[PDB]
Amino acid sequence: MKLQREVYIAGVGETKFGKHTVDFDVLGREAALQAMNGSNIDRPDMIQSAYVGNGMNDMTTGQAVFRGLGMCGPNLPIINVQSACSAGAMAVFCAIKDVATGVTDLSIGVGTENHTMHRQSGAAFSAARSDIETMHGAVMTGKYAMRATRYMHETGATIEDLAMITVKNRKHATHNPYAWFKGAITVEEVVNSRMVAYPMTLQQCCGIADGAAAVVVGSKEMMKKLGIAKPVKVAGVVVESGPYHNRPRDITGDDITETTSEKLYEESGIGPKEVNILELHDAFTIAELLYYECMGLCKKGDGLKFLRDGQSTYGGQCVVSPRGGLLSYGHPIGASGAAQIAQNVKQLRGECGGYQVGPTPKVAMSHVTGGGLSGTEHAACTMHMLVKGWGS
Amino acid sequence: MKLQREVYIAGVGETKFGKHTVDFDVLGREAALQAMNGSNIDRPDMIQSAYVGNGMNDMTTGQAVFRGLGMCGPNLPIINVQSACSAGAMAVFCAIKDVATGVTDLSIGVGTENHTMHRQSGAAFSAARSDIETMHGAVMTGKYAMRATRYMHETGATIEDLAMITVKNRKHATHNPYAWFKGAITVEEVVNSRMVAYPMTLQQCCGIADGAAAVVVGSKEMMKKLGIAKPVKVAGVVVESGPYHNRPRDITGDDITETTSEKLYEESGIGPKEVNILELHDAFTIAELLYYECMGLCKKGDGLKFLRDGQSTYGGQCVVSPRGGLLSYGHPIGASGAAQIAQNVKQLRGECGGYQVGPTPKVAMSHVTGGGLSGTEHAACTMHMLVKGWGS
Amino acid sequence: KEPDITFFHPDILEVPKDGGLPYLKGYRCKKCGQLDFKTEMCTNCWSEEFEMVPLSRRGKVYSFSDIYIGQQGLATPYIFAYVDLPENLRVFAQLEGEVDTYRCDEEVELTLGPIRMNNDNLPIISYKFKKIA
Amino acid sequence: EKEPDITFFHPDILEVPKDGGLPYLKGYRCKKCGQLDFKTEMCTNCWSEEFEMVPLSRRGKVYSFSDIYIGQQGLATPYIFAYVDLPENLRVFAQLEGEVDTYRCDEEVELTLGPIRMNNDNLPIISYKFKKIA
Ligand SMILES: CC(C)(COP(=O)(O)OP(=O)(O)OC[C@H]1O[C@@H](n2cnc3c(N)ncnc32)[C@H](O)[C@@H]1OP(=O)(O)O)[C@@H](O)C(=O)NCCC(=O)NCCS
Ligand SMILES: [Cl-]
Ligand SMILES: [Mg+2]
Ligand SMILES: [Zn+2]
Numbered sequence A, B: 001m002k003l004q005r006e007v008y009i010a011g012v013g014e015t016k017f018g019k020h021t022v023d024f025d026v027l028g029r030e031a032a033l034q035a036m037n038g039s040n041i042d043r044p045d046m047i048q049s050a051y052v053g054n055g056m057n058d059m060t061t062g063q064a065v066f067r068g069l070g071m072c073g074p075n076l077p078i079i080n081v082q083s084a085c086s087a088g089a090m091a092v093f094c095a096i097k098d099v100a101t102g103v104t105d106l107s108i109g110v111g112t113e114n115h116t117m118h119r120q121s122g123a124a125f126s127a128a129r130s131d132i133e134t135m136h137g138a139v140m141t142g143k144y145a146m147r148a149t150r151y152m153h154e155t156g157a158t159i160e161d162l163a164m165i166t167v168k169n170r171k172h173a174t175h176n177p178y179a180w181f182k183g184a185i186t187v188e189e190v191v192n193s194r195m196v197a198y199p200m201t202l203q204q205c206c207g208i209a210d211g212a213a214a215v216v217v218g219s220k221e222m223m224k225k226l227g228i229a230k231p232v233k234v235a236g237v238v239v240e241s242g243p244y245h246n247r248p249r250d251i252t253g254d255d256i257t258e259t260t261s262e263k264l265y266e267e268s269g270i271g272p273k274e275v276n277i278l279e280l281h282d283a284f285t286i287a288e289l290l291y292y293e294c295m296g297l298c299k300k301g302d303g304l305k306f307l308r309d310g311q312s313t314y315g316g317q318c319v320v321s322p323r324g325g326l327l328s329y330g331h332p333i334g335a336s337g338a339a340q341i342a343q344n345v346k347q348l349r350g351e352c353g354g355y356q357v358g359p360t361p362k363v364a365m366s367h368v369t370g371g372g373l374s375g376t377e378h379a380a381c382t383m384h385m386l387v388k389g390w391g392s
Numbered sequence C: 001k002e003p004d005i006t007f008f009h010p011d012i013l014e015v016p017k018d019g020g021l022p023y024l025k026g027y028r029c030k031k032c033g034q035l036d037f038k039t040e041m042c043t044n045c046w047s048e049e050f051e052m053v054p055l056s057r058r059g060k061v062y063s064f065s066d067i068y069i070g071q072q073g074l075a076t077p078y079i080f081a082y083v084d085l086p087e088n089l090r091v092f093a094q095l096e097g098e099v100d101t102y103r104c105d106e107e108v109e110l111t112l113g114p115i116r117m118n119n120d121n122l123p124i125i126s127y128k129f130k131k132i133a
Numbered sequence D: 001e002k003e004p005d006i007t008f009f010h011p012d013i014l015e016v017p018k019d020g021g022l023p024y025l026k027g028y029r030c031k032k033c034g035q036l037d038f039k040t041e042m043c044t045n046c047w048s049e050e051f052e053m054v055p056l057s058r059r060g061k062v063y064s065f066s067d068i069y070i071g072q073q074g075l076a077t078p079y080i081f082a083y084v085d086l087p088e089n090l091r092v093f094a095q096l097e098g099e100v101d102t103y104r105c106d107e108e109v110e111l112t113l114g115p116i117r118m119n120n121d122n123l124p125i126i127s128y129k130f131k132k133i134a
């Protein structure tokens, strides 16, 4: 979406991710409060609209979040959003659109979820028998496993190459207190973990987790009035839905990630080789590897070389998953897309201590997908391009 | 929300409501296609953004709806929305906002739900899954019933007075093929139907229904480009969240319906006495009666006089629930907010045949809430004010 | 396999271990004086500093409903109510007793009893209100 | 329910001739724009509703596959599924008959029928699968 005027991020918020015994509303409120306090907001009703992303907690999650801040009422229109894993990023996108279009000058996006406190059958995470691939036994890990098998067939990638994505992402998370799993894990531990659908083992799959994040966005004038020291510019943001057809696809590509990222580069005027850090939808190791190519960080077929050459870790062309990714945080459905943005902002501002990328990144990109009925690669894709917005 | 430029409704779509065996995606697709056909849209590549409301079916409802229409892809951002029963109206609101701001010139809002294929009967809806009142057994029937018990206590009104709401709404629906329940029913049949949550008997409770509806909106130029003969102008639209507190509020009032309707009157420049037809959240008989006063259709204390005098039926000040309301359609959570708008449009256009209001209405208002959140009467409220937009 | 709760909830219902009469607990914000049920932060001023306030065991039925069609899995009929306390707080709770017997503005008293079965099919004991003598 | 759940999937995709002829997959070609697809109410490219039935090749090619060790509830593990490409340029998702650790990408396979899952009455649903040719 082209931005009709500049939009900047002021304060962000982020809970610890993992197994929480407080629910989605408490987590979301903690993240919202942090983001508002980090925006130097003295009058909460300066926040003119709120969007909250969630997957399966409830139908009024944003009102449940804000009610405990005393902020519900006639001066806070709240809309909750859903696109499976896209929801938290879409919440921030809706807030950006309100500001960019002048509907508001200051808005907030929250993504929140608590899964582990709730009995979720397993059928809630899958489509109904009505879906043709589900009728025939499809499971998500096997769908991505097929992408990995095809990639190994074409490139000679081994299961050990795939496992290095978990190793890298957990390494990045070592000193990150928000991440759930972190630190050194050996390739053999990843490869020898239980096989789910060949070649995806358990440690190559992100897990279910609980968490929340929040992002306040506002106009240039609002950044000056709030005294924001390091406003992060929204250089671009794009939402797409996934094309449906039944023709052979190259599943080492990704139709909607390719088109969404290309549109993001075109609208923002920032190309993929300029991106310094990237958070993406690493629900499985193979996804991050393919998205190196799908996003144009490297050429078709070169993702394996990019990985092995160290181009996606510290010192390389683009540090991918510097917070640790879904493979270290786990994946609270409504939270991840907002959480990526919160951590990218902290990295741009130099605030991440022992997991801070050096030299400081200036361009940060984020990506979540979500869903995917038969004949689609994904149901949705939301990507944000963020850049340093303060001078010298 | 103030509209930065004019926004008009072109085609609308509506399924029959009741117990469906086809799921939410099929219902939604049928309504969306009907709305597109009614807009002279004959190709999948014309609509520029889509919003889809839903309560409990799916985290990617809109992508499921549009998949089989070949409309998902890089030029159709789809975002799904939730605020319990507000969701179908919020979907139309989001579409309106895209057009009003110039983000798009042509968008669509869809509301859809299938409840009956995914639950057992014999039980009422609880409050929110994470809500304290749900722990104690809260059901939405009893939450509204408590408002009736208190109203009866304070005014002397009887269960036979409340029953007149069902009689009237079912009468309105007599010739409407979309409604679930309709036709002549006596006060005695309403009052002697089985008690559900005292003093709400079965026939005073909205059904748990399946259905869908859709609304295409566009700019003034887009209406002309599409040859729309009777474009309906959005005169105003307002979204609020409900005040939260644990103090002894008067539940015979309705904080958020009062403030939302006042804001709609102020932004649209149209007062309550100028509204010709009204579709409101008649989830229970008591709700409609209370909202006569909350929305300012009559003075404090005159709600029951307003009803008894015929002011809310044919020939009166405002025909309320001319389609039959939730008490005749039943209430698929994600659909009702959009369905109210589709039927209001048809009434403005003179297209409702045997249930057409005369004289043809020029001003049509709609209202849905969304609840289950403790300490709020409603978590959310969305109201639309629509007017004739074709000259003579 | 770790067990489900059998009591709801220590943050709102105090059961003195000495055997003293149970009571509902409110909290007063030290910064602004607002009284509320337990919260992490004050809804009025966002302070996190509170004092615990034992609440009146007596209240008034503001409204109620006799429930014949319940939540999935709950035995029926049951009764619930908004019970208003002298401290100007409204509690949602089940009422002990029979359908067709309560009235608005009826005085009621706190009592403990089962509100539902837990996932191990043991009763969850919580706060309810009952008629006075 | 004593009205039975399905035992076959699906009459508009897998044609089982009543005279005993060999079953085959079928597609439907849009008469307006020429798009081939499995059966749909309207062409997803041009929204035409006018089609011609196209019998499809019984030989296909494994584009990719995975050996499933932890799969859907109620299905016996391990099982195998795959994307099978047909020469008409349509991709079919299907189970593969056989053992784990024996398929490869680009392997030729042939249509066959067998149980893909149990239905709500605990009776098999029969549908299409693919198997090794030799
Ligand atoms: C009142 C209520 C509990 C009745 O549901 P129920 O007891 O389970 O009834 P059933 O679904 O089993 O239906 C029984 C029969 O009564 C009829 N029926 C069901 N609900 C009805 C209703 N609300 N009004 C009139 N008739 C109804 C049905 O047609 C049905 O016969 P069928 O088998 O041919 O379809 C349910 O409608 C309800 O909870 N409504 C309120 C929903 C709500 O709270 N919505 C949110 C508002 S904010
Ligand atoms: Cl409600
Ligand atoms: Mg304020
Ligand atoms: Zn305070």
Ligand SMILES: [Zn+2]
Binding pocket: D030, D031, D032, D033, D034, D035, D043, D044, D045, D046, D047, D048
């Ligand atoms: Zn065609």
